[PDB]
Amino acid sequence: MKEFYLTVEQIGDSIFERYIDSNGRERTREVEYKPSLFAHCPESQATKYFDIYGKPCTRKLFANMRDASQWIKRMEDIGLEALGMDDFKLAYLSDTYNYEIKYDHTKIRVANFDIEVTSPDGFPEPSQAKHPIDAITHYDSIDDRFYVFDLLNSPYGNVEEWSIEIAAKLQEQGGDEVPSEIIDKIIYMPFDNEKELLMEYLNFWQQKTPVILTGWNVESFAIPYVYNRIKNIFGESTAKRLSPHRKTRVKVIENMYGSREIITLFGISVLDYIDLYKKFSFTNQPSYSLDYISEFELNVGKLKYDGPISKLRESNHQRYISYNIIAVYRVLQIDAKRQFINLSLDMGYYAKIQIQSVFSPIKTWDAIIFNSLKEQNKVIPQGRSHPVQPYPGAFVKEPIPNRYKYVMSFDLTSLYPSIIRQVNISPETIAGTFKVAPLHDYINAVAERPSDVYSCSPNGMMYYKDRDGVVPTEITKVFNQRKEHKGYMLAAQRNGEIIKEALHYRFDFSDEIKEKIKKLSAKSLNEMLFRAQRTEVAGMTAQINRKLLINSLYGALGNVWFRYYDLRNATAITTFGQMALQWIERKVNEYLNEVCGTEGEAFVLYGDTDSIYVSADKIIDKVGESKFRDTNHWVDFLDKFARERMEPAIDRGFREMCEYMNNKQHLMFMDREAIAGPPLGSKGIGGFWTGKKRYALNVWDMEGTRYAEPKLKIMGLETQKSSTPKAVQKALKECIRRMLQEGEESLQEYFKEFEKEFRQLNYISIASVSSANNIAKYDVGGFPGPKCPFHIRGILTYNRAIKGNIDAPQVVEGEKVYVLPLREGNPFGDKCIAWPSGTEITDLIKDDVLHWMDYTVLLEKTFIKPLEGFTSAAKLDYEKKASLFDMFDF
DNA sequence: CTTATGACAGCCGCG
DNA sequence: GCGGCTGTCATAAGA
């Protein structure tokens, strides 16, 4: 097999790399790497090395890496560019691995672990590690085994051993329902004391040292906890054994109010799963805990247990340990679904970076561009320092707040990356400046053509048109690779099924390879379909990773810490987008006025960053609503009209803009997204806007896919807000469903009924939610001080009423919290109360809270008020005989 | 982050 | 005694 790296670290003047050798064995090596860096030289001197500006550069080889750094500082002090890859780990990887890295995941130790720490006095802080580690479940991907470490004796109890037998049994049998898939894979180790467990774990760690170390919240908790626990007990020198190179950096990151401890374990790649999810699932989840995410992804979640976690070990050690086994397994299941680790390995090996740098677009892009330019003997720029200077961003239109009966939306694809390639934006491609007219002038073609020589963005910038820019080239390359790998994708995935359906690879091979294959087999047709499906697996991941690069380019480009950052270019990109969405609002409005025989009608009712929303009202009126045999008939009509009449007019429009800005190539393409409207022959309103980023739509067709039942596309509204009570999210969604599909009378009936039935709803279902941030800041001795927000006052009411019970769950800084208003004259002595979320409120006050809460204020605050928002905008009433003069701001 | 809106505190001015 | 309006805060929604 072809050699590939596992981890890389620079320590002093050495690279410490762990890598898989040519056979497949994991080994480690220490190289005294000699980096090269580059300086500008006379045109007299001949090299093969040029900077991206075409200026010639001397390659300077250094005896070691400390000579290189000291040269850079010394070159900085003189005032001359010191160019080339300043991060030597990367430059090393580029040197040692000058080929397309093929990697065998089978030879990469991916560790999955979670610990348990019984704490009777609140959250066990990792940087303290006050309390003993009583359970460690560590999953190893090579042995494919769950190594379970069980503390039998601790200050908090002596417990029996965990039973594998009981664990397997059903819930109703007294069992833990530990999945049969893992029962023969658990390896169990009880211990008599914490010292033995920890040292056996550490000795386990040296034998089976992780390459990729993952698991839920491991980077914020499990890892610092273990390190500090071992540090504090055995000495720092023992805790450092947790690194295959015995070097650890202790880092304290700062927040929006506080800080956090992270431990860098040199020679290991920490890919916390809570980060691998946030990064590459793309789903704005309301809670990022493992219970939720696991329920979401697997509909199974974490193991249930009676009582507080802090009393679990003594009351039910059996549940406790299995709880810890399932936790790890849950994580492994999610990854069996999403493949986020393999995604990371693929990206990390593609860009040739440390795998943990996948969370950095800057690092990933820098390397991709570095390797690319190195291959053509080019030299990258020195990272220049830059003042963080806000520039203009995405355009969003003010919508006139209204009901909107028929809407079609359109989206420019990859707007920003597309703009880069279209205008040819790149540091070295900057041609010059032109006088800037107001943006609206360029938007209306009224302005003077900026240049007939150079490619242009309406921010005043001019770019070389002939040249191939670094940035535009490197992104085009990724676009191409995307198409390519989606090519093998839609081949092994598409042509593959021909082999599968017959039983009853990158390109669909000639009808001689497909011909000589027709003999029904158990060794062939059904075991060679395993190949075609495993091939498309590779297609997906390669394509997802290209998509991820494409979208995370502007972010890197807009970051002052990026080698290729340039404020005028960032501003060029976004300003160009700003004109492009609005130029096409003009072009669509003009086309639709011509076609409809109207003049000066606002068809585009909303536009946001890369997409427009278009009223289809008059287009329907042209046919007249009455010629459609059903809903699906007009959805057909509008779809055809879009693809046939509207999109060529859109393309004609953008082609005109391209000639106007004099761009290198025309890459402004709009797909048609949603088609929305009411069900035929109904009183529904279809859709409505209340303002920027707030709207609901009744959608029948999202780009191609024609839905069975209609589905609500709701954006920004209270339904989409975790702060909204469970019951109330539900009702407002219904309120909206009823508004759009059924009409005003439906809504009024629903409103009346819910209002009538409010007090019979669960108190948890009707309590609002919010995060507890800056709890101290407004805590004036347990009472609310100046400027104190409503929910924190709510907490400081719970506290005073609760200061004295240890059984009572304390409210912690950071924690999400149920809030409830309280009726005047309440014992609790305040306008509201708040308690920890996802929990029933303690019996000590519960029955008295349920008595004092203000239903009127609650319903008004969380339901009626935001409803009034929707109905006001949609020109509807949620109850009869509402005087129409309310509409006016007298 | 940049684009946002909305809940709520607290100012100022209002015979 | 509330509008009007600025500032903290919470949270989308796509990067």
Short mmCIF file of C-alpha atoms in Angstrom, two decimals, chain A residues 616-781:
data_model
loop_
_atom_site.label_atom_id
_atom_site.label_comp_id
_atom_site.label_asym_id
_atom_site.label_seq_id
_atom_site.Cartn_x
_atom_site.Cartn_y
_atom_site.Cartn_z
CA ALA A 616 -47.21 34.77 -9.61
CA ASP A 617 -50.54 36.50 -9.03
CA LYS A 618 -51.04 38.14 -12.44
CA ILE A 619 -49.52 35.17 -14.31
CA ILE A 620 -52.34 33.03 -12.86
CA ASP A 621 -54.81 35.80 -13.65
CA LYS A 622 -53.75 35.60 -17.31
CA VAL A 623 -55.04 32.03 -17.56
CA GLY A 624 -57.65 32.90 -14.93
CA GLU A 625 -57.93 30.69 -11.83
CA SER A 626 -60.99 28.96 -13.29
CA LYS A 627 -59.31 26.96 -16.09
CA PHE A 628 -57.38 24.64 -13.73
CA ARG A 629 -58.78 21.16 -13.11
CA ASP A 630 -56.92 20.99 -9.75
CA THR A 631 -54.07 22.47 -7.68
CA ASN A 632 -51.52 20.41 -9.58
CA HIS A 633 -52.57 22.07 -12.85
CA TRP A 634 -51.47 25.59 -11.86
CA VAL A 635 -48.29 24.27 -10.19
CA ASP A 636 -47.60 22.72 -13.63
CA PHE A 637 -48.39 25.99 -15.36
CA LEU A 638 -46.14 28.10 -13.14
CA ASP A 639 -43.34 25.50 -13.34
CA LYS A 640 -43.46 25.50 -17.15
CA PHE A 641 -43.65 29.29 -17.29
CA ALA A 642 -40.57 29.43 -15.06
CA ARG A 643 -38.45 27.00 -17.06
CA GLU A 644 -39.69 28.25 -20.46
CA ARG A 645 -40.38 31.97 -20.22
CA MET A 646 -38.70 33.24 -17.09
CA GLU A 647 -35.30 31.57 -17.01
CA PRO A 648 -34.17 32.56 -20.51
CA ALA A 649 -35.23 36.11 -19.60
CA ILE A 650 -33.17 35.73 -16.42
CA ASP A 651 -30.19 34.46 -18.40
CA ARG A 652 -30.58 37.22 -21.02
CA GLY A 653 -30.64 39.66 -18.09
CA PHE A 654 -27.48 38.41 -16.36
CA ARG A 655 -25.61 38.06 -19.68
CA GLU A 656 -26.32 41.74 -20.13
CA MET A 657 -24.87 42.52 -16.70
CA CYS A 658 -21.79 40.48 -17.48
CA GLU A 659 -21.13 42.57 -20.60
CA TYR A 660 -21.85 45.71 -18.54
CA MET A 661 -19.33 44.89 -15.79
CA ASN A 662 -17.09 43.44 -18.55
CA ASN A 663 -16.58 40.19 -16.61
CA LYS A 664 -14.27 37.31 -17.55
CA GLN A 665 -17.15 34.82 -17.87
CA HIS A 666 -20.92 34.66 -17.18
CA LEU A 667 -21.61 32.42 -14.17
CA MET A 668 -24.85 33.94 -12.79
CA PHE A 669 -27.35 31.07 -13.02
CA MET A 670 -30.70 30.90 -11.21
CA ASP A 671 -32.47 27.63 -10.39
CA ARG A 672 -36.20 27.88 -9.69
CA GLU A 673 -36.84 26.91 -6.08
CA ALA A 674 -40.31 26.98 -4.50
CA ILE A 675 -43.76 27.26 -5.96
CA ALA A 676 -46.27 28.38 -3.38
CA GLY A 677 -49.99 29.18 -3.29
CA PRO A 678 -53.30 28.08 -1.72
CA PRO A 679 -55.03 24.76 -2.48
CA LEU A 680 -57.35 25.31 -5.46
CA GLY A 681 -60.87 26.54 -4.71
CA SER A 682 -60.05 27.33 -1.08
CA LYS A 683 -60.00 30.47 1.06
CA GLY A 684 -56.32 30.02 1.96
CA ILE A 685 -53.89 32.90 1.39
CA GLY A 686 -50.91 30.89 0.16
CA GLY A 687 -48.15 32.88 1.84
CA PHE A 688 -47.28 36.07 3.68
CA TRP A 689 -44.41 38.34 4.68
CA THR A 690 -44.25 40.36 7.87
CA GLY A 691 -40.76 41.73 7.18
CA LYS A 692 -37.16 40.91 6.31
CA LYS A 693 -36.34 37.27 7.05
CA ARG A 694 -39.87 36.62 8.43
CA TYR A 695 -42.42 34.79 6.28
CA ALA A 696 -44.42 31.62 5.68
CA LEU A 697 -45.23 29.88 2.39
CA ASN A 698 -47.48 27.02 1.30
CA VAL A 699 -45.12 25.02 -0.89
CA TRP A 700 -46.07 22.44 -3.50
CA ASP A 701 -42.90 22.15 -5.53
CA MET A 702 -39.34 22.72 -4.40
CA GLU A 703 -37.12 22.54 -7.53
CA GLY A 704 -38.44 19.50 -9.36
CA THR A 705 -39.77 17.55 -6.37
CA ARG A 706 -43.58 17.83 -6.41
CA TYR A 707 -44.90 17.16 -2.90
CA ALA A 708 -47.74 14.76 -2.02
CA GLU A 709 -49.33 16.92 0.65
CA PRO A 710 -48.42 20.64 0.72
CA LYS A 711 -45.71 21.62 3.21
CA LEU A 712 -45.17 24.90 5.04
CA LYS A 713 -41.93 26.77 4.42
CA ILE A 714 -41.88 29.04 7.47
CA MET A 715 -38.89 31.38 8.02
CA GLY A 716 -38.05 33.60 10.98
CA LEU A 717 -41.49 33.31 12.57
CA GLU A 718 -42.09 32.31 16.19
CA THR A 719 -42.76 28.70 15.14
CA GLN A 720 -39.08 28.45 14.19
CA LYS A 721 -37.90 29.66 17.58
CA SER A 722 -36.88 27.30 20.42
CA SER A 723 -37.70 30.09 22.88
CA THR A 724 -41.37 29.47 22.03
CA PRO A 725 -43.33 27.02 24.28
CA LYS A 726 -43.92 23.53 22.85
CA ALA A 727 -47.71 23.88 22.85
CA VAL A 728 -47.52 27.36 21.36
CA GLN A 729 -45.13 26.49 18.52
CA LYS A 730 -47.65 23.82 17.65
CA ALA A 731 -50.68 26.12 17.67
CA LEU A 732 -48.99 28.97 15.75
CA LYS A 733 -47.90 26.48 13.12
CA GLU A 734 -51.51 25.34 12.90
CA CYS A 735 -52.61 28.98 12.86
CA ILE A 736 -50.31 29.43 9.88
CA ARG A 737 -51.32 26.17 8.17
CA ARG A 738 -54.91 27.30 8.57
CA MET A 739 -54.14 30.84 7.37
CA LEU A 740 -52.47 29.65 4.15
CA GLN A 741 -54.46 26.54 3.21
CA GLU A 742 -57.89 27.04 4.71
CA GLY A 743 -58.41 30.75 5.29
CA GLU A 744 -59.59 33.27 7.83
CA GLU A 745 -62.64 31.54 9.29
CA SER A 746 -60.69 28.35 10.00
CA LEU A 747 -58.12 30.45 11.87
CA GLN A 748 -60.72 32.23 13.98
CA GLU A 749 -62.26 28.94 15.01
CA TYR A 750 -58.84 27.60 15.92
CA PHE A 751 -57.88 30.73 17.83
CA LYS A 752 -61.14 30.80 19.78
CA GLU A 753 -60.78 27.10 20.64
CA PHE A 754 -57.14 27.29 21.77
CA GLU A 755 -57.88 30.38 23.87
CA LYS A 756 -60.81 28.48 25.43
CA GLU A 757 -58.57 25.45 26.03
CA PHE A 758 -55.32 27.16 27.13
CA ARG A 759 -55.56 26.50 30.89
CA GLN A 760 -55.96 22.75 30.29
CA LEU A 761 -52.52 22.56 28.68
CA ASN A 762 -49.44 21.21 30.40
CA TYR A 763 -47.46 23.94 32.22
CA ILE A 764 -44.18 22.74 30.70
CA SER A 765 -45.76 22.82 27.23
CA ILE A 766 -46.74 26.48 27.68
CA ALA A 767 -43.60 27.76 29.41
CA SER A 768 -41.20 29.80 27.29
CA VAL A 769 -37.49 28.92 27.15
CA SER A 770 -34.21 30.87 27.13
CA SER A 771 -30.50 30.54 27.88
CA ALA A 772 -29.08 31.82 31.19
CA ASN A 773 -26.17 34.11 30.28
CA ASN A 774 -24.52 36.66 32.59
CA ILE A 775 -26.37 35.38 35.69
CA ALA A 776 -23.90 37.12 38.02
CA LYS A 777 -23.86 40.43 36.11
CA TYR A 778 -27.42 41.24 37.21
CA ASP A 779 -27.39 39.37 40.52
CA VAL A 780 -27.49 42.14 43.16
CA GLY A 781 -27.42 39.87 46.23
#
